[model samples]
Target: GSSGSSGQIDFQVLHDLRQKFPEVPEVVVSRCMLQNNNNLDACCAVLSQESTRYLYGEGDLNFSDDSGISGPSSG
Candidate 1:
């Protein structure tokens, strides 16, 4: 298979974004950078606005939190 016209991400810039926002997830930061087309302001804005919701892994699992799936199958 062949791919066409892709924008490359720079490690230096990616690292800077990570360094600037220590608390934000690296994956999220990288994604924001991609979404913003490597623009810091747009990336940070997306991160700042979406950070709260993405900060946690999941939503309301309170009821299921009590039991670890409660299933016989381990896998």
Candidate 2:
């Protein structure tokens, strides 16, 4: 779920996966269309802002409305 910060879910999870598996730096667990294509294609993303010093949710591509923040969502 974006690591409760900023960036994409695939990206953030990959970031966390990196630290956990430094030896395999390039390895990343990403969602594939085959898994859930129809409207359920919400790939989470999280990013840590330098100035803000906080993690923010970034990519809610298919799930977010205009507001980009509201209601519940499933990853």
Candidate 3:
């Protein structure tokens, strides 16, 4: 909606962002750009924050290394 002048969406910029960061979704890239008011640096910061969140298991599952068994069973 509020992409450019007269409601004109820039596909090339979105495409470039998608191409540059293949890991981030296209829609997300577009949304980030829009949300940041077309500021590349801000958009990148947001993306980095999101990436870090996922990397640290913020929204996803965080599995534990131990399986409750400390050593071999003796009985």
Candidate 4:
């Protein structure tokens, strides 16, 4: 978590989330992303929880594996 960045999911996370989990509704991901306070893993957890019980079949998505602010350091 960089000081320049805050707890907002923003367009980056929103787009990343949707991209990682294809076929999911954009609005739903946005809602869960906000509800989870920018916690991407938690957002995916909720999505799985809701989706599994609904129309989702089998394991859908979960990309919480060493994902961080992926950028090259200029140092």
Candidate 5:
């Protein structure tokens, strides 16, 4: 499921961390604007959608918790 050798980010992990520390947008924290680019938005979108589905889908083996589930079924 990774895009390249970097092992596409695990949104589950990011989401889990998000619960404790929300507002973790895809944009850089120090940037003048919040997510100031389409590419950033797109990247975040992919991560969010995939992570959301991966984390929250019903009966997904990939998921370990039900906290992030909300999307199309994984099967």
Candidate 6:
């Protein structure tokens, strides 16, 4: 899990991210790290994207029923 530049993986960074985004799940943190090969900056970018999607409901498929698009008419 070496970061390309430093050729090292600082586990401290994981702890640091946890402090920064306390609500972020550890699974996401590890997944982000894997995507970036343990690069903090890259992992941050990944986490940001994911967090945004989650916040906006883009990460989920459940749509609001109150948006005027009701289910199929039964008539």
For model 4, residues 1-75, the per-residue Cα lDDT tens digits are 444434666677766676665456666666677666665667666766645533444454543322112233346
In Å, residue 72's CA in model 1 sits off its true spot by 32
Instruction: Kindly list the per-residue Cα lDDT of model 6 for residues 1-75, writing each as its tens digit.
Output: 553553344567777777765566666676566556566666666666666554554654433221211133346
72 in model 5: Cα distance from truth in Å? 28
lDDT string for model 1 (25-55, tens) is 6666766666556666666666555554444
Q: Of models 5 and 6, which has the larger TM-score?
A: 6
- Where does candidate 6 have its weakest 10-residue lDDT segment? 62-71
In TM-score terms, candidate 3 sits at: 0.49
Query: Which pairs clash (backbone N, Cα, C closer than 3 Å) in model 5?
Result: 56-69
Cα lDDT computed for each candidate against the true fold = 0.56, 0.28, 0.53, 0.57, 0.37, 0.57
A best-first ranking of the candidates according to their TM-score comes to 6, 1, 4, 3, 5, 2
lDDT of 6 at 48: 69
Candidate 1 runs further than 4 Å off: 1-6, 56-75
Best by TM-score: 6
The lDDT, on a scale of 0 to 1, for candidate 5 is 0.37
- Clash count for candidate 5 is 1
Q: For candidate 4, what is the lDDT?
A: 0.57
